[PDB]
Design an enzyme around this catalytic site. Structure first.
Site, PDB file in Angstrom:
ATOM      1  N   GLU A  55       0.832  -1.194   0.000  1.00 35.30           N
ATOM      2  CA  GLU A  55       0.000   0.000   0.000  1.00 35.30           C
ATOM      3  C   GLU A  55       0.872   1.252   0.000  1.00 35.30           C
ATOM      4  O   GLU A  55       1.970   1.269   0.562  1.00 35.30           O
ATOM      5  CB  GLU A  55      -0.923  -0.003   1.222  1.00 35.30           C
ATOM      6  CG  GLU A  55      -1.879   1.182   1.315  1.00 35.30           C
ATOM      7  CD  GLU A  55      -2.902   1.200   0.194  1.00 35.30           C
ATOM      8  OE1 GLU A  55      -3.880   0.431   0.276  1.00 35.30           O
ATOM      9  OE2 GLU A  55      -2.736   1.983  -0.767  1.00 35.30           O
ATOM     10  N   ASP A 101      -2.187  -5.153   0.817  1.00 36.20           N
ATOM     11  CA  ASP A 101      -1.579  -4.048   1.547  1.00 36.20           C
ATOM     12  C   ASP A 101      -0.167  -4.357   2.021  1.00 36.20           C
ATOM     13  O   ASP A 101       0.714  -3.497   1.931  1.00 36.20           O
ATOM     14  CB  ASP A 101      -2.447  -3.668   2.750  1.00 36.20           C
ATOM     15  CG  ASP A 101      -3.750  -3.015   2.342  1.00 36.20           C
ATOM     16  OD1 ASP A 101      -3.732  -2.194   1.402  1.00 36.20           O
ATOM     17  OD2 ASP A 101      -4.790  -3.324   2.960  1.00 36.20           O
ATOM     18  N   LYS A 147     -15.312  -7.906   1.829  1.00 36.55           N
ATOM     19  CA  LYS A 147     -13.914  -7.819   1.418  1.00 36.55           C
ATOM     20  C   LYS A 147     -13.447  -9.119   0.774  1.00 36.55           C
ATOM     21  O   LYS A 147     -12.783  -9.102  -0.270  1.00 36.55           O
ATOM     22  CB  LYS A 147     -13.036  -7.465   2.619  1.00 36.55           C
TER      23      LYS A 147
HETATM   24  O1  LIG Z   1      -6.023  -0.989  -1.592  1.00 36.13           O
HETATM   25  C1  LIG Z   1      -7.157  -0.543  -1.762  1.00 36.13           C
HETATM   26  N1  LIG Z   1      -7.524   0.184  -2.816  1.00 36.13           N
HETATM   27  C2  LIG Z   1      -6.571   0.749  -3.756  1.00 36.13           C
HETATM   28  C3  LIG Z   1      -6.898   2.185  -4.111  1.00 36.13           C
HETATM   29  S1  LIG Z   1      -6.480   3.389  -2.874  1.00 36.13           S
HETATM   30  O2  LIG Z   1      -5.134   3.141  -2.445  1.00 36.13           O
HETATM   31  O3  LIG Z   1      -6.800   4.687  -3.393  1.00 36.13           O
HETATM   32  C4  LIG Z   1      -7.555   3.070  -1.511  1.00 36.13           C
HETATM   33  C5  LIG Z   1      -7.063   2.451  -0.375  1.00 36.13           C
HETATM   34  C6  LIG Z   1      -7.909   2.214   0.693  1.00 36.13           C
HETATM   35  C7  LIG Z   1      -9.228   2.599   0.632  1.00 36.13           C
HETATM   36  C8  LIG Z   1      -9.714   3.224  -0.495  1.00 36.13           C
HETATM   37  C9  LIG Z   1      -8.879   3.470  -1.571  1.00 36.13           C
HETATM   38  C10 LIG Z   1      -8.240  -0.767  -0.743  1.00 36.13           C
HETATM   39  N2  LIG Z   1      -9.451  -0.267  -1.025  1.00 36.13           N
HETATM   40  C11 LIG Z   1     -10.449  -0.426  -0.154  1.00 36.13           C
HETATM   41  C12 LIG Z   1     -11.794   0.153  -0.541  1.00 36.13           C
HETATM   42  C13 LIG Z   1     -12.812   0.298   0.604  1.00 36.13           C
HETATM   43  C14 LIG Z   1     -13.392  -1.104   0.699  1.00 36.13           C
HETATM   44  C15 LIG Z   1     -13.616  -1.458  -0.755  1.00 36.13           C
HETATM   45  N3  LIG Z   1     -12.525  -0.753  -1.444  1.00 36.13           N
HETATM   46  C16 LIG Z   1     -12.161  -0.905  -2.727  1.00 36.13           C
HETATM   47  O4  LIG Z   1     -11.716   0.038  -3.371  1.00 36.13           O
HETATM   48  C17 LIG Z   1     -12.258  -2.283  -3.351  1.00 36.13           C
HETATM   49  S2  LIG Z   1     -10.995  -2.562  -4.627  1.00 36.13           S
HETATM   50  C18 LIG Z   1      -9.684  -3.442  -3.831  1.00 36.13           C
HETATM   51  C19 LIG Z   1      -9.971  -4.325  -2.791  1.00 36.13           C
HETATM   52  C20 LIG Z   1      -8.946  -5.018  -2.172  1.00 36.13           C
HETATM   53  C21 LIG Z   1      -7.642  -4.845  -2.582  1.00 36.13           C
HETATM   54  C22 LIG Z   1      -7.343  -3.980  -3.610  1.00 36.13           C
HETATM   55  C23 LIG Z   1      -8.362  -3.284  -4.232  1.00 36.13           C
HETATM   56 CL1  LIG Z   1      -7.957  -2.203  -5.522  1.00 36.13          CL
HETATM   57  N4  LIG Z   1     -10.238  -1.102   1.020  1.00 36.13           N
HETATM   58  C24 LIG Z   1      -9.002  -1.624   1.344  1.00 36.13           C
HETATM   59  O5  LIG Z   1      -8.850  -2.225   2.418  1.00 36.13           O
HETATM   60  C25 LIG Z   1      -7.984  -1.436   0.415  1.00 36.13           C
HETATM   61  O6  LIG Z   1      -6.785  -1.946   0.735  1.00 36.13           O
HETATM   62 MN   LIG Z   2      -6.751  -2.563   2.737  1.00 37.14          MN
HETATM   63 MN   LIG Z   3      -4.840  -1.610  -0.303  1.00 41.01          MN
END
Ligand SMILES: O=C(NCCS(=O)(=O)c1ccccc1)c1nc([C@@H]2CCCN2C(=O)CSc2ccccc2Cl)[nH]c(=O)c1O
Ligand SMILES: [Mn+2]
Ligand SMILES: [Mn+2]
Length: 179
Positions: A64, A92, A118
């Protein structure tokens, strides 16, 4: 110029605010408008950093916070050297001790319902999942919480402090209702 945006910048350290802004501009989102998502990403980022500091010196590889291409590059290197399956979605962290990817979750709702969504979304039953809530509960895959109790308690304390700071500024209601 929202109240929430100014609270975020004075509550989290500039390095985390920077990475969250860079993260939000990929995927094409504005920190100035999507204020609650801005606060959520900073919070998730700090939890990941605190989580990685809970183990031994170099136990966790941090995925992350990296740009999409570099994060996938490290995921490829970890897979092509440990033989671990390649996840469909970016995790992450990577646990060099337990040899598994971790996706940390931070939710304002029940840890039970957030866990199910999730696991369904990532479709990677081998990625270890660990959820934290702002109220102090946690849920981990196979009830395996990776870190000792003291490292997780520090994360829960900081999470409750963040919610207190927003409640005292009348921003918690809009934040909780934003998830
Ligand atoms: O890594 C994430 N997203 C990358 C873009 S971010 O870094 O801008 C960001 C980082 C963290 C949060 C938002 C935005 C990340 N997202 C999410 C968000 C909220 C829950 C659903 N959800 C998504 O978006 C689903 S998609 C996805 C799901 C799992 C792994 C990777 C992806 Cl891509 N919850 C997390 O726990 C999380 O780790
Ligand atoms: Mn996460
Ligand atoms: Mn993430």
């Amino acid at each position: 110029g929202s109240h929430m945006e100014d609270f975020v910048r004075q509550c989290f350290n500039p390095m985390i605010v920077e990475l969250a802004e860079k993260a939000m501009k990929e995927y094409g989102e504005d920190p100035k408008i999507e204020t609650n998502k801005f606060a959520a990403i900073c919070t998730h980022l700090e939890v990941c950093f605190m989580y990685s500091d809970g183990g031994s010196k170099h136990r966790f590889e941090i995925i992350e916070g990296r740009d999409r291409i570099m994060a996938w590059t490290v995921v490829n290197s970890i897979c092509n050297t440990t033989g671990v399956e390649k996840p469909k979605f970016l995790p992450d962290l990577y646990d060099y001790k337990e040899n598994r990817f971790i996706d940390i979750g931070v939710t304002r709702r029940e840890v039970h319902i957030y866990y199910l969504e999730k696991a369904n979304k990532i479709k990677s039953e081998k990625t270890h999942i660990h959820i934290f809530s702002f109220t102090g509960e946690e849920m981990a895959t196979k009830a395996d919480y990776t870190l000792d109790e003291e490292s997780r308690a520090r994360i829960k304390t900081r999470l409750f402090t963040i919610r207190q700071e927003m409640a005292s500024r009348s921003l918690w209601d809009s934040f909780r209702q934003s998830e």
